[PDB]
Design a protein around this ligand. Sequence first.
Ligand SMILES: *[C@@H]1O[C@H](CO)[C@@H](O[C@@H]2O[C@H](CO)[C@@H](O)[C@H](O)[C@H]2NC(C)=O)[C@H](O)[C@H]1NC(C)=O
Ligand SMILES: [Cu+2]
Ligand SMILES: [Cu+2]
Ligand SMILES: [Cu+2]
Ligand SMILES: [Cu+2]
Length: 495
Amino acid sequence: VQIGPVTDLHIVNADIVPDGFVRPAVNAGGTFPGPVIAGNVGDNFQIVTFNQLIECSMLVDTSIHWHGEFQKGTNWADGPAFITQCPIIVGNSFSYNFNVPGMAGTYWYHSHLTTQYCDGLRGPFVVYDPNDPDANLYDVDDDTTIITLADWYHVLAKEMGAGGAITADSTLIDGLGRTHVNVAAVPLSVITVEVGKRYRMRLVSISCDPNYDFSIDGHDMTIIETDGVDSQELTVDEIQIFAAQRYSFVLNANQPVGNYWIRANPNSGGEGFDGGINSAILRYDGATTADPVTVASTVHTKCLIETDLHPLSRNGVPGNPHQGGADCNLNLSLGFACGNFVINGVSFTPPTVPVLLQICSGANTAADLLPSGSVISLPSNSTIEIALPAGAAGGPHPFHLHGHDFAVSESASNSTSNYDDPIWRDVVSIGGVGDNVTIRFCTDNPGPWFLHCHIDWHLDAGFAIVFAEDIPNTASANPVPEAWSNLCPSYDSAH
Ligand SMILES: *[C@@H]1O[C@H](CO)[C@@H](O[C@@H]2O[C@H](CO)[C@@H](O)[C@H](O)[C@H]2NC(C)=O)[C@H](O)[C@H]1NC(C)=O
Ligand SMILES: [Cu+2]
Ligand SMILES: [Cu+2]
Ligand SMILES: [Cu+2]
Ligand SMILES: [Cu+2]
């Protein structure tokens, strides 16, 4: 189902059994995954979030992030708890009111309090472009062609320990999937196609953790969009998609009428596809209603390599074509030790007063800002470079920057930089020990922007910092509505 751009979104508890195991959940709009929130580029989104949560087990406070939306002028609407807001308390509501100029493509939204999105608050967000330059490449683009991949846990997020390696109990594709252990023959998701039609498939990782090896038996996939950025056409036969990344790919339904397995292998949890784990069904109209009996290629011969992606537009790369060729070049020391992650020796632990409120109240510098050592100021209109050398305990970490997308100057498993035409995205794997994944952007968006690993268990264990971008201009650029000012006093009173 699609809603928006102006809509109510209620946050409720519901028990669900996507793999046959009933357990509690935190739902947006009453379904798992949440409904698709949608609009056209340039639309005013007004999402009134009614928090009706009752089950403390998963926290009754909530806060929602519109993942990959830049929020320029509306840093207050971004969603991360204690960075841009206090959580909305149960029984109250809050209007995330914002515009999406410049932006089109496939996004998503999720709770950004603690590890609550794991417990089910996650869904797709699609900005349609009525003048999409990729339109002529396909026949069908609609709600039936969105594909979500989700990790699902039998253990309540708040009780995951932490961290402490943690693994999912099943993979859900469009909210259905089978349990990795003691697999019950529960219903699988079906994605129906018609002989000869081309589909814009919108592949969305809503994962709290694992990355997926994604393929469709018998079929190719032509990538045309990455984390919201239009790409040149890239035909692959397998896609490794890390947590919170998105691809649009063209599926040409050119195989014989029949049933073909859709495969998404997580990097942890259940391995293989026995009894239909890690699986969904590609069904052609006219096929018999039966399980596919297809096999993956023994070796995939054209799997996605990030370095083969190129923007469709002439995005290029900011700065100079050498490492340090930026106004403010950074190299973050990403560590793990004793159950906590650090960035430059500091583990993130949420401040009592949100970063933005601190600024609104008169803070001027990162030194003025709490938590100490968890904030780095950026000057305005400057080319930033962030090197993110990997090695820290597992791995591979998908880093995400709020309020921005970014050139991937250097990708995983490859030490050659690209200062001509690398793909731009918003979530990138930092690869493995010895890699030096590097990103670049321009500071054109005043506000405190979260930078964190999108493995949510790694976020709760401190793997994050705030880029306080243009502290001096922050208040002026981001006028807040009174409802936002009301958040922290309510939350603090309630607690
Ligand atoms: C990965 O990339 C960064 C560059 O973006 C490298 O940073 C250099 O590091 C050395 C020592 O750490 C400094 O003396 C230089 O000033 C840095 N060069 C700059 C900032 O241009 C970093 O060493 C690399 N990390 C690796 C390969 O793990
Ligand atoms: Cu996110
Ligand atoms: Cu985000
Ligand atoms: Cu991580
Ligand atoms: Cu985030």
